[PDB]
C-alpha cells in the first residue's frame, strides 16, 4: 500500500578513515624548518571557523582506536626527518630463527637550524565533518551526550617529549586519569591537569650543564590534586607512591625533550619521591648528541651544542604514569616514549565522519 | 487581555508535607501553562512545560495536572531548599502576563 | 553549559533611552527565540516582547507599543534591547531568556541571563 | 500557541531531530556539500579539493538521474514496499525516530532497494513506453 | 606451553612471535604479574622486578617480528613462567633450571 | 532457459549488439563519461579533470534545452518524416546496429537537432504564457 | 583467440579439498556465464555448476550442495572451484567453458579449457 | 496586486527587462521567499 520515496540532503554519517589537509597558519619567509614545511604542506587558516552545536544526540567516542592519531604521527615523521638532519644515522635493515644483519650508516651535512613549535590545525576536507565531545568529565571512552560539529580543531602544539607533556592544552573542571584499560598493568595512564605548571628550562653563559627550575608549591599542590583523582579507583583508603623509573635507555628514564635546537636530558629523581597516605627545585640536565631515534629503531649523531644561553619556558599541562602492578599500596612510575600517547591527550575528542546524504523511506506516494 | 489568579498568595508549611497551588485564568487556555520558581537575588528556572511534562533536570517529586481555567502544581515533599516563589504563565495570545507569586514559608 | 550573558548596570535620568545586550554561549543562536522580561523590585514579572534571531521578525506587547524596540546582530550572537522615555516606573531588573521552541510555537524559557539592574 | 515562523538550526543540526521535521529542513545540507612559491603550493591543492567537490556533487547528481528524479530532493517512486524490510506504524516512524537509527538499522538492506529503485522504476516505466 | 631448559651462571633467550610484519607494544610478565621489560614506540622499558640488570631484547628484530628475551648470568630463581602479551595474544613459556 | 541475471559487458561493449539491447545498457556508457612534479604532473591530471566535467556540463545543458534534462530516455513532439530513410520499426530495433543507423542517418541529424531547439521548448513553451 | 588457461594436474588424498582456476583471455570476463564440468574416464558428460561472473552468485544441481564453491576474482579474472571430502568417484579430468549467452539464457559452451586431471 | 501590477500588454510590449528588473529592485526577496519556501515544501508536504 505505501510506497518508497528517496531523500537528497538528510543529516547522516558513518564512521570513516579518509585523509585530511594540515591548514596551518604558516609565514613563507622564516627558516624556523616549521615554517619550510608548513608552506610546503599546509594552506592558510580561514579566520571565521564554522561551529554548529547539535541538537539531543549521542554518540560512541573511542579515543585508543582513533583515525586521526596515526595520521598526526606520519606527518610529525616526515617534519622530524625533513628538518633535523642527523651527522651519522645507523638503521638496521635486513630483509629476508637467526637472521644476521649489518647496520646501514647514512652519513649527510648536519648545520645547525632553528627550531620552535607553532600551532596546527587539522581541517577536514568537503563532504566529511568532524564531531567534538564537549562533555567536561569525559571518561575518554563510551558514549557522550554533547556533541558539536565543528569546521576544524583548536591550536595544536606538535611537542616532542617524554614522561611530561609541554605546552599542552588544558581540562575544563578538574584534573582527569585516561586509559585503554585500567587495572591491566601494562597500558598507559595519561593524567591531564586542570592549571598549567609553569618550567623554566635553561643552559646559561663545561657546556653540557643545563639547569631547569621548577616551583615546589604549585607541584606540590598539583600532585595532591592528582593523588586525590587517583585514590577514587582505588578504594579511597590505599597508600600512593611515585618512583623514579625503572632501567630502560636513556630517552624514556629521564625527561628527555628539545629546546632551541638541543636535546635537554633532564633528570625526574627530583620531583617523583612523595609517598602519599589517607621553593624551586633544580635539575641536572645534560644536552646529548649521540641519540636514539623515535621516528624508526637506529641511533643518530647530532652536533656539539651552539655556544650561547639556551633559554626556554614551557607549562607542563600532562603526565604519562605506569601502574606497577603486584602484591596494599600502589606505586605509580612515569614512561611513554610511544610518540601516539603525546598526540592522543590532545585529538582525545574528535571523530571523523563521512556525509551520506541519500536515504530512502517509505509512505504514500503515487507513481 | 488574560488575568492570571494563584491560591493562595502565602503559605505556610514544614519540611516533608504535601501542598497544592492552584493556578486559575479568565478563558480557556487548553494546556500551554508553564511553571516557574524564584529565589530572590537569583534568575528563575523552568519546572513544567506543557501543564504536565517534567523539565529534565528537576526532581521527580513534582507534579502538575489541570486543564480548561483550573490549574494544580503539587509538591509530594517539601524540601528546605525548594521553598521559592512559584510562577505560572499562560501563552495562548498576546500579551503574555504572569500570575501573582506564590511565596511559600 | 547553555548559558546568557548580559551587560552591566546602568542609571538614566527619566525620558531617556537605555540600551541592553544579551549574548548567547553554549548553543546554535538562530535556532530558539529570546524573550525579554522584567521584575520591578517587590512585585512580580512582567513580559516586554520576543524576537526571531534568523529572520528579525520581531512581537512587542500592546502596553508597550513605540516604548522598547528589539534587534540583533548574528556576528557576535547578541540581542540588543532598546528602552525610550524612561519614567519612573521602569526602575527593574531586565532578563533575557532563550525559549525551548519546540515545533515552532512558544513552549516555555529554560535559560535565562544574569540580570541587568536600572533605575 | 503564537508562532513567528522558521529558524536555521546549521549545516547538520537536525541530526537529532525526529524525521518529521528533519523531511522540512531538507535544503540546508544539501546546499553546503557545493559550498609564486605561495601560488604553486598553496594553490593546487585547494583547486583539487573544490574540483573534487564538484565532481562528487556531480555523481550524486547523476545517481539521482539514473533514479527518475531529475532534480526534486524529496522525490517519490513506483517501488513498493516489501514488508521483510522492517515495518512500524506510520506514527512510530515518523515521529519517533531519528535519520540516524532509521539508517543504522535499514543498512543491512540498502543495496536491494538501490538496485530495486533502479530496475523496478527505470526499466519498468520505461520500455512500456516504447511500445 | 613451551618448556626451556638451561643451565647456571649462563644465558637464556625465549622466543615470542608476532603475526605481522610492523612494530608492536610488547610486554613480559612474570607469575606474579609484574613487568620486567617492555617497549613504547622505538624505546626499551624495563620493569621494576629483580630481574632489572639481567634483562635484554634484540634490537634489531622489533621490525622483524620476533620479539626474544635475553637472561645473562642467571640463578635458580628465575626459574619461573612467562607470559609474552603482544595483540591481546598471551605466549606461556615455562622455563626449569 | 534458466538465468541468473544481467552481465556488464563494459564501456562501449555493445556497440555490435542491436539496437534493441544496447539501449538498455546506456546507464553503463552514461557513468564512465563524468617542486618539478607538483608543477608539472598534477596540473595535467586537473586539466583533464576539470575538461571531462565540462564537456559533460555542455551536453547535459544541451539535453535540457530540449525539455530533456536529467533523464537518459524523453519523448518530444517532432513527427518522424518518412523521408528520414523509413524503415519498419522491428527491423530498426532488432536487426541493425547503432553505427549503422548513424551511417543511414547522418545527412539529416542536423535538422533534426535544428527542429528539436526551434519548436518543443519553444513551443510548449509561449504557447503556455498565453 | 578467445582461450581458457588453467592450473596444473593435482593428486590429492581422499577427505581432502582440490582448488582449481581458470582465467579467461581475448574476452571480457565479466560478460558471458561460466560453466564448470567433470569427466570420470569412460562415462559421459555430467555437470557441476554456473556461475555469474559479474554477480558472484553461483548454482550447483541438487547433489552436490555444500560439496564445491565456486568464486570469482575480476582482478586478475579468475575462476576458483573447491571441492571438499574428496572421494574415489571424483577422479577425473576438469573443464571450465564459457557460455555463449544469448538474450541472458543458456545456450552452449563454445570455449573450453584443456582440462585439470584430480586424482 | 501590488508589486507595481500593470496591464500584461504593456508589461511584455513596451519595457525592457532592464526597467522591470529595476522596478522590482526592492521586492525581489519576498518573491525569492514565496517561491522557495512555503511554497514547494507545501506541494511536496502535499503530494505526500
Ligand atoms: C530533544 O529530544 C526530545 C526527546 O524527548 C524532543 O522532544 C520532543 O519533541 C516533540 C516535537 O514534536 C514534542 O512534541 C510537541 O509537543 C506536544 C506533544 O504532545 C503533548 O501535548 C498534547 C497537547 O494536546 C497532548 O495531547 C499529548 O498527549 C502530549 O502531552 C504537541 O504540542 C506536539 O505534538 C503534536 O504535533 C503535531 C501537531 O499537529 C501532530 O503531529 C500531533 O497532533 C502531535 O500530537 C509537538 O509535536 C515533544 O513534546 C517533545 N518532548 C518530549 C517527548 O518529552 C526534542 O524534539 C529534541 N530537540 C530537538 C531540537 O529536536
Ligand atoms: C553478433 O552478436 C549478437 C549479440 O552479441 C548476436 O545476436 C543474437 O542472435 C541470436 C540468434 O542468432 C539471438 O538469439 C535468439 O534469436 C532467436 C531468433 O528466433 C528465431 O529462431 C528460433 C530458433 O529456435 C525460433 O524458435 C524462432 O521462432 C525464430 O524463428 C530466438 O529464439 C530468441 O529471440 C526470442 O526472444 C527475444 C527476447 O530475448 C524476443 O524479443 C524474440 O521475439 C524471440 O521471441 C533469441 O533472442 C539473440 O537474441 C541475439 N542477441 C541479442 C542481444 O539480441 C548475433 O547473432 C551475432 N552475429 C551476427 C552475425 O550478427
Ligand atoms: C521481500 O523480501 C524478502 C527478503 O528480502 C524476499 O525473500 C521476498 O521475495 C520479498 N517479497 C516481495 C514481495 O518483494
Ligand atoms: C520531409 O522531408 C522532405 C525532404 O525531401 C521535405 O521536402 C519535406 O518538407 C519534409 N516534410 C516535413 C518537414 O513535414
Known sequence: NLWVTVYYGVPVWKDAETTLFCASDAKAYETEKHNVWATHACVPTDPNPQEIHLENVTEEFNMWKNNMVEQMHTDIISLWDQSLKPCVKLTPLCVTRLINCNTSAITQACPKVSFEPIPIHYCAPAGFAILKCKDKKFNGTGPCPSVSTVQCTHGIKPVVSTQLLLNGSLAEEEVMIRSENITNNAKNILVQFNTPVQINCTRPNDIRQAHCNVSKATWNETLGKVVKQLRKHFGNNTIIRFANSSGGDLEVTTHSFNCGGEFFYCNTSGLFNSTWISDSITLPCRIKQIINMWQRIGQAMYAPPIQGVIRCVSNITGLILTRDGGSTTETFRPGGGDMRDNWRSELYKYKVVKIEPLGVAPTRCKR | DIQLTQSPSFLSASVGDKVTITCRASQGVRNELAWYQQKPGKAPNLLIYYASTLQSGVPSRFSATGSGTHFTLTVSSLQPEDFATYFCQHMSSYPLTFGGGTKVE | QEVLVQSGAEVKKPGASVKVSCRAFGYTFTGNALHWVRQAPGQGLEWLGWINPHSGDTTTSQKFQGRVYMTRDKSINTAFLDVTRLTSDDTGIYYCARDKYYGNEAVGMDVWGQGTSVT | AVGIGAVFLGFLGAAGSTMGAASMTLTVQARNLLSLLKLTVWGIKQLQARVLAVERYLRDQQLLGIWGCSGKLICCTNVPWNSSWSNRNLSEIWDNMTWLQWDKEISNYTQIIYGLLEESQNQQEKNEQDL | ?97
Do not use: M
Open chain 5, 1 to 97: 606451553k613451551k618448556v626451556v631448559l638451561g643451565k647456571k651462571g649462563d644465558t637464556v633467550e625465549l622466543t615470542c612471535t608476532a603475526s605481522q610484519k610492523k612494530s608492536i607494544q610488547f610486554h613480559w610478565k612474570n607469575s606474579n604479574q609484574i613487568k620486567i621489560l617492555g617497549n613504547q614506540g622505538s624505546f626499551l622499558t624495563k620493569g621494576p622486578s629483580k630481574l632489572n640488570d639481567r634483562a635484554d631484547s634484540r634490537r634489531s628484530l622489533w621490525d622483524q617480528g620476533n620479539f626474544p628475551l635475553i637472561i645473562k648470568n642467571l640463578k635458580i630463581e628465575d626459574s619461573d613462567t612467562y607470559i609474552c602479551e603482544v595483540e591481546d595474544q598471551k605466549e606461556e613459556v615455562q622455563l626449569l633450571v
